[PDB]
Amino acid sequence: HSCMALKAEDGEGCTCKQTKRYGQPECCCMGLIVSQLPTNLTADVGYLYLHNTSISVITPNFFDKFPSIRELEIDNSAHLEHIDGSSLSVLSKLRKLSVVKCPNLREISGKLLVNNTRIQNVILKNNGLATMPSLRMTDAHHVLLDRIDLSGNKIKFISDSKVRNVKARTVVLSENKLIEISGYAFTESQFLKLKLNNNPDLRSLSVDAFKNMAGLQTLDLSHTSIDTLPINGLKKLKTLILNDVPTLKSLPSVLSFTDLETAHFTYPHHCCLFKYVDDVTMNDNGKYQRNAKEIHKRICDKRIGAEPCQSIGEEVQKYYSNITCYPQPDALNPCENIVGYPFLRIAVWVVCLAAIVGNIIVWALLGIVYEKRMRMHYLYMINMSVADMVTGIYLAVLAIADAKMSDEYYRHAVWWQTGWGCRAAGFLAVFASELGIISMFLIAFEMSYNTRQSFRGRRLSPKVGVLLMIGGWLFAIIMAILPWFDVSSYSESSVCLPLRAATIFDKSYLIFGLSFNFLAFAAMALSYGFIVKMLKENETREEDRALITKMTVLVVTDLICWFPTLFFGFTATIGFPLLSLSSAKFVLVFFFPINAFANPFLYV
């Protein structure tokens, strides 16, 4: 409160007062005037506080004047360049140490907290610390550190055996710019919760970085580029947190963990990898075979009467089932199966074969009905057949993937889902959908303009029609190739559809798609009405009047099918996952595929 009284006085000086609650007096120094603490200062001070004094650098003998110090705090000191930790450590009875808002405090040297058996907690946050303090410890400390914090600093490396024998609950290294943690970074220490989150640049961890530790209850690595989690030392974690670490493709063996109860992973399939371990756990037959032999008794020795100990291959899975994982699998990211129900499997196979057969029918019957004179709309019908063929290829990819990956999907799931293959599948699907939409709109507009101007005596240029076709093709291609990048990812579904909306920009992409669907529906309705009016004005030819009738059936069926599409989208304004997303998938796989599959029987 001495600092508060000084700030109320606004006098850049040191003021002290004695408190009866603790006996020792409290002194605070403040302002730019004080370059060093004045000599006429009491020595029995327990609590020493410094508000942005002009101390440029703490000398190795700076704090030695006052032996009875018990608490320290330094704040806002913009002039602090370097501090020698030894002089601070000479303070035997130092209970708490805090340093904040020092921007230029580039280094703290020496083995801190050594020879100081009374430290209770350390707070070092929002400082320009450019290297890890060399924290050592010894077993004399009667009270463990409540919290030791280095968050908000700029540390980048943790060399061999930097933090030894510290006994503490919470240790935090978040927000730092770590690039590597070397082997044996910790040693002999026990931590209740070690924090390593919000560290974008952390790529490589040494395989034995957490080896030789004396205990680690909970650990979190969220927002990290960790490639492979270390195997050793982590054999006792109660909880594991690997949130938002897309580089963590393949986890180390689930067998190694022994007592974990809660685990948050980034990809959902690791949850099933933990759950579906039912047949995997008994296969180790090594050191963890002994560990399993030991853990089974640990439960079954104490679990009217009671069941006997079932074998080490069933009770271990019974215990492992209790392990809760947050990215739980769903119908959109299923385990052991891609398509699931056998009816759907055989239906997908037959429908892929039938889509290919329909494209073949398009080719053959269009060649049969082909007129000698070049026609503008033959190319459009061919492009719609191409859209149908792409849909068939997408379903073929899904079918063959389900055929190959059956019964072992959860192991291979992440590689397929994030891999190049899923991006290709999503490209195929969305490109087919957009190509069909733009092709329907283009053929409707071309027929409308040709019919309308032909009766008046003019015509829309067929080269303009080809230009519109290539413009729509580029539209579909750019709509499909963009989600390859992070505008909207294909990795959020097991069938590679773009059910992605997290960055709000992906929401912009989906809004653009929905708006284009609405514009296509409105344009088709209006252009078809105008076509009906023009047909009322004048009649068409005969041998190609089959195509005119096909346009009329487009007038009917396109409106019939796209009318409930927007209605379902509007009724799904809540956007409930796994229900509205399924509706969107069904809409995409129905309504463009309507015309796509119709193409043979439509065009004949």
Ligand X SMILES: *[C@@H]1O[C@H](CO)[C@@H](O)[C@H](O)[C@H]1NC(C)=O
Ligand Y SMILES: CC(C)CCC[C@@H](C)[C@H]1CC[C@H]2[C@@H]3CC=C4C[C@@H](O)CC[C@]4(C)[C@H]3CC[C@]12C
CA separation (Å) from 216 to 165, 189, 209, 274, 350? 13, 8, 13, 21, 54
Choices 109-117, 153-161, 456-464, 565-573; region in contact with a second copy by CB under 8 A: 565-573
CB of 31 to ligand X, least distance (A): 4
For position 138 contacting ligand X by CB under 6 A, the verdict is yes
Strand order across the beta sheet in which 204-205 lies = 157-158, 180-181, 204-205
Q: Report the C-alpha gap between 491 and 418 in whole angstroms.
A: 5
Stretch that binds ligand X, among 30-38, 351-359, 432-440, 487-495 (CB under 6 A): 30-38
Q: Does 11 help bind a second copy (rule: CB under 8 A)? A: no
The two beta strands, 324-325 and 262-264, are parallel
The DSSP output letter for 251 is: P
Burial letters 134-167, b for 16+ CB under 10 A, else e: bbbbeeebeeebebbbbbbbebeebeebbbbbbb
Query: What is the x/- site pattern for ligand X, positions 81-100, by CB under 6 A?
Result: ---------x----------
Task: Please pick, from the candidates 200, 215, 419, 564, the single residue that binds ligand Y as defined by CB under 6 A.
Answer: 564
Instruction: Specify the residue, 51 or 269, whose C-beta has the smaller distance to ligand X.
Output: 51
* Rounded distance between C-alpha atoms, residue 327 and residue 339, angstroms: 20
Q: Footprint of ligand Y on residues 567-586 (CB under 6 A)?
A: 567
The reply to whether 143 sits near a second copy by the rule CB under 8 A is: no
Read off φ and ψ for residue 529, nearest 5 degrees: -60, -40
| Contact of residue 138 among ligand X, ligand Y, a second copy, none (CB under 5-8 Å per partner type) | ligand X
User: CB 566 → ligand Y: shortest distance, Å?
Assistant: 8
When asked if residue 518 is in the footprint of a second copy (CB under 8 A), the reply is yes
Counting contacts by CB under 8 A, is residue 305 touching a second copy? yes
User: Which of these segments, 24-32, 176-184, 441-449, 571-579, binds ligand X (CB under 6 A)?
Assistant: 24-32
Q: Which of residues 176-235 bind a second copy (CB under 8 A)?
A: 190, 192-193, 215, 217
21, 40, 301, 368: which one binds ligand X (CB under 6 A):
40
> What is the Cα Rg of the chain in Å?
35
Binders in 337-356 for ligand Y, by CB under 6 A: 347, 354
Binding test (CB under 8 A) with a second copy, winner from 171, 435, 521, 581: 521
Pairing of strands 239-241, 145-149: unpaired
3-state secondary structure of 469: helix
Residues 6+ apart with CB under 8 A from 295: 258, 316, 319
Indicate which of ligand Y, a second copy, ligand X, none lies near residue 192 (CB less than 5 to 8 Å, by partner kind): a second copy
| Interacting residues with ligand X between 536 and 565 (CB under 6 A) | none
How far apart are the two ends of the chain, measured CA to CA in Å? 91
Cα gap 229→219, rounded to integer Å: 11
| Closest distance to ligand Y from the beta carbon of 347 (Å) | 4
CB nearer to ligand X: give 9 or 259: 9
Contact between 532 and a second copy by CB under 8 A: the answer reads: yes
Token pair 């007129």: residue: 371
Task: Specify the DSSP element, H or E, that contains 550.
Answer: helix 545-571
- As given in the structure block, the two tokens for residue 496 are 């590679």
Is residue 512 involved in binding ligand Y (CB under 6 A)?
Answer: no
Residue 552 interacts with, from a second copy, ligand Y, ligand X, none (CB under 5-8 Å by kind): a second copy
Q: How far is CA 165 from CA 110, 285, 447, in A?
A: 16, 34, 82
Tell how far CA 539 is from the center of its chain.
59
- Interface contacts to ligand Y, rule CB under 6 A: 347, 354, 560, 563-564, 567, 594, 598, 601
- Interface contacts to ligand X, rule CB under 6 A: 12, 14, 16, 30-32, 38-41, 51-52, 76, 78, 90, 114-115, 138, 140
